[PDB]
Every structure is written in structure tokens, then in C-alpha cells.
Amino acid sequence: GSDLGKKLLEAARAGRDDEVRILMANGADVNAADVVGWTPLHLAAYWGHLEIVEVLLKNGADVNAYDTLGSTPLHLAAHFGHLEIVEVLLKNGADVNAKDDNGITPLHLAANRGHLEIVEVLLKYGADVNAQDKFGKTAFDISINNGNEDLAEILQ
Template identity: 45%
Template sequence: MLYKKTPLHEAALYNRSNAVQWLLSKGADLESRDDDGWTPLIVAAANGHTQVVTMLLEKGADVTASDNAGKTALDYAYGDTATILRVHSGNVFISLLN
């Protein structure tokens, strides 16, 4: 492990969904943390990897987990990845136009 990154961190970083699926099937720790306190979910979200984010959430990754700076995956996410995290966390705001 480099800098306390697990194979799941690396698979999430490089958007290797097949590797993520395999690692999860072997019991990889969803909440493992690197030196910065990043979980695999934070890594995937920060890099915009929507499929990996979805896979991790479906396996029960903690959407509220924060890193050493107190930031969550949603703080780093953008685009569709941010939307997926908001929907999963129930943090969805709907505005109705009259």
C-alpha cells in the first residue's frame, strides 16, 4: 500500500469498476482511509466516477464519512456524481415553478 491507499482506493481512483466489484465481493473495507482520511467513496466522488460511486453506495458506503479536513464525498463531488450522492443521502432540493 502506498500512502495507506488500499487496492479499493486505487480501483476507485482509476475508475476500474470491474476491480471495484471484485474487491467488494472479496470483502474489501468500504470505510478504509488513506493518509488524508479519504475513503474509496470520497476518491471516486472527487474524480467524477459515477459508476464506482454508485457501486460503493449500493454496498453501503457511508455518504456522511468525512476526511481529515472535515469534508465529505459530496463536498468534492461535481456533476452527476454530486447528484447521485445528494439523492442517496436524501439531500435533494426540488423547486417548483408556478
């Protein structure tokens, strides 16, 4: 990578909007990835930094960038209950049916943590409700196992 690529990964994670702003002006690599394959957008999505997610996507960040285990920023945002970021990523063309190495989708992760608003947004953008993981489990199979009767009704 590069020196500024490291500072952007740190700034994006930390939630330092002003530092990200200056780094985007100076031309810090938006596609800079750490050893596990996490871009600044991965980190911003994980820690729930909405403005940085939007600024990175404006500066040509790969919305469908995946780590060394095949997980995308939408996977992270959907799993940790960041509703606004999930909407932004999906508007900027995030693959709603993105499968990691385990066959897990953003819908599976949202269903597992009982993020009802996010599950509805994924279904609104055409989330495959019948999509199975490596163990042949759907988002509905997770809801009945978790005992989330509200979520199970949405997924029908």
C-alpha cells in the first residue's frame, strides 16, 4: 500500500470526519486494505461512521469490496445494526445477495441480531429470502431458532 492508505484506514475506523476530508483532498487510496482485506469503507461500515461512508463512496470507494473471508461492508453494516449506512450502501449499488465464504448474506446476519428495520430495507432492495448458507439455513430458519416471532412473520 502507501503511507496515506494506512492513515485513511485509521481515520475511517476512528470516525475522524475532518482527517478523512483532508486525506480525500490529498488523494489517500480509498482501495487501501489491511492484512485481513478490510478497506476504509469496511471499517466505517463496521463502527457505524455514516458521513465517512458517504464521503468514501463519493471518492470512488468499491461498495462491493470483500475481505479474505469474502465479507463486504453491507455484511458488516447489516450485522451491527447500522440502518442509515445499509440504505446508503444499497443506493450506491451494494450487492444485496452478496455471499461470504460460508454462504452467509447480509439478510442472514441482520436476522441473527434481530435488526427488523434493516431486514425490511434488504427485502425492499430484493434480498433473496430463500438464500441458504453452507448449512442450508435461511434468514427464516434463524428467526425460529432464535425465537424472534416478530422477525419470523416479516419473512413469512
